[PDB]
């Protein structure tokens, strides 16, 4: 069975009810291809709102969660709350969480374990910074990040891996499609060697670097790129073009 | 100073259980001399504001320091206002000590929240090792000063003292020890801002409070109310709302 093309739209910390309402209206109107899995991740205040307005064909993801079901953790939400709001995914280990808010691999691992235990799907994010790539340790970094995730996964059917080329985000650097493919191929090889062949074959590995309507078709044609985690462009009509990257 | 009772639900509840809690709060006759605020989990700010009677205000449990941006997992004061909430809790001990939020970051959050029209419940408090070293006064005054640097109009600010040194540590705070810290903090406001601000600013207590202890704590001259934890999820919260009655 082919890996189903997966496109996640991460709205990050953007939007209000009115503007997200318009965004959602555009997405509902768009004809999503068969065999294409679309997921939108609203700001945490709008998970409930977004699920109510979005067509059921589009799934909703939380942008983060914590590692227990309830507790004295002012400012956090649990997988239980996310599910209760009708969302079915959570983004974990996103570059912004790791590098702005200092979330450790250990913590991310604990979050993955809990989210999966609770019945959520997980979009698990990995990626190396510019100083890490320039030091020639891309492989070591993303393998270690993936290992911690893998150590906390008991069912990969609910997991999507997202590779973020952080070295090519906000640094002025650009990644070619071959550079994306190179990392994706290594990651799938890691899954094959450390988890199983079945998991390597079936697990979506999506690209989280710069992608546009003009570049998405070429990136999507790379053998080991299974879709995208889209940031800024997920807020624009351009997102529809990216959903249709296989058409 | 209007008595101020904040209920921090922390990371607790679902729509079913929180709907039941809200039903209880809506049924509660809220005293005219008491300002009540509830702080739901972030996923439920919208839900809570929808279901809660307008007599009770809604607070976010945290926010970030710009109006929009690439900060996955965060929300801005603009989103909070957009959901009908009028307050945000900042610098809560859990943010500082579990999620490593610095004074600097908290200060910047306060400045942005206030500039965007939100009220701020700004939390401070010393840990056990700090207290036993005899630097309570230092720790809280410094935390307060970073907040104050980022406050222009205090009409929208409430200071909350958390005796972190008494949370699961084996120590607990007497009403006298609470009053002691609160009295100093007011004098701080009198010293470095203005007597007006000191007289008008609510300084609420964020330590253990129960229906059984709230009246004695509330009777302390410089305790202007509470930031309630666990009890805020129970009918007992109404007893605490009634603390000055
Ligand atoms: K492909
Ligand atoms: Na009313």
Curated annotation (Swiss-Prot), chain A:
Modification Phosphoserine, positions: 19, 78, 104, 157, 196, 210, 221
Active site: 94, 164
Cross-link (Glycyl lysine isopeptide (Lys-Gly) (interchain with G-Cter in SUMO1)): 140
Record pathway: Carbohydrate degradation; glycolysis; D-glyceraldehyde 3-phosphate from glycerone phosphate: step 1/1; Carbohydrate biosynthesis; gluconeogenesis
EC annotation from Swiss-Prot or TrEMBL: 5.3.1.1, 4.2.3.3
Positions of post-translational N6-acetyllysine modification: 12, 154, 192, 236
Highest taxon of the lineage: Eukaryota
Pfam families on file: TIM
Residue list for modification N6-methyllysine: 192
CDD domains per the UniProt record, alphabetical: TIM
Gene3D superfamilies in the cross-refs: Aldolase class I
Catalytic activity: D-glyceraldehyde 3-phosphate = dihydroxyacetone phosphate; dihydroxyacetone phosphate = methylglyoxal + phosphate
Claim: Lyase is one of the keywords in the record: yes
Protein's GO biological process: canonical glycolysis; gluconeogenesis; glyceraldehyde-3-phosphate biosynthetic process; glycerol catabolic process; glycolytic process; methylglyoxal biosynthetic process
GO molecular function, one term: methylglyoxal synthase activity
NCBIfam families, per the entry: tim
PANTHER family, A to Z: TRIOSEPHOSPHATE ISOMERASE
Protein name as it appears in the record: Triosephosphate isomerase
Chain's gene name: TPI1
């Amino acid at each position: 069975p082919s890996r189903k093309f997966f496109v996640g739209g991460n709205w990050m910390m953007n939007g209000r009810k009115q503007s997200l309402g318009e965004l959602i209206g555009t997405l509902n109107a768009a004809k999503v291809p068969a065999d294409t899995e679309v997921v939108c991740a609203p700001p945490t205040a709008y998970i409930d709102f977004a699920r109510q307005k979005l067509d059921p064909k589009i799934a909703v993801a939380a942008q983060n969660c914590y590692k227990v079901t309830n507790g004295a953790f002012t400012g956090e939400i649990s997988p239980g709350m996310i599910k209760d709001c009708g969302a079915t995914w959570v983004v974990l280990g996103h570059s912004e969480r790791r590098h702005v808010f200092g979330e450790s691999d250990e913590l991310i691992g604990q979050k993955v374990a809990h989210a999966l235990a609770e019945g959520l799907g997980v979009i698990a994010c990995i990626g190396e910074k510019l100083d890490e790539r320039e030091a020639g340790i891309t492989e070591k970094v993303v393998f270690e990040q993936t290992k911690v995730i893998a150590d906390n996964v008991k069912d990969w059917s609910k997991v999507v891996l997202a590779y973020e080329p952080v070295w090519a985000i906000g640094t002025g650097k650009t990644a070619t499609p071959q550079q994306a493919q190179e990392v994706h191929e290594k990651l799938r090889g890691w899954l094959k060697s450390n988890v199983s062949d079945a998991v390597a074959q079936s697990t979506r590995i999506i690209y989280g670097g710069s992608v546009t309507g003009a570049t998405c078709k070429e990136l999507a044609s790379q053998p080991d790129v299974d879709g995208f985690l889209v940031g800024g462009a997920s807020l624009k009509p351009e997102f529809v073009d990216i959903i249709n990257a296989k058409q």
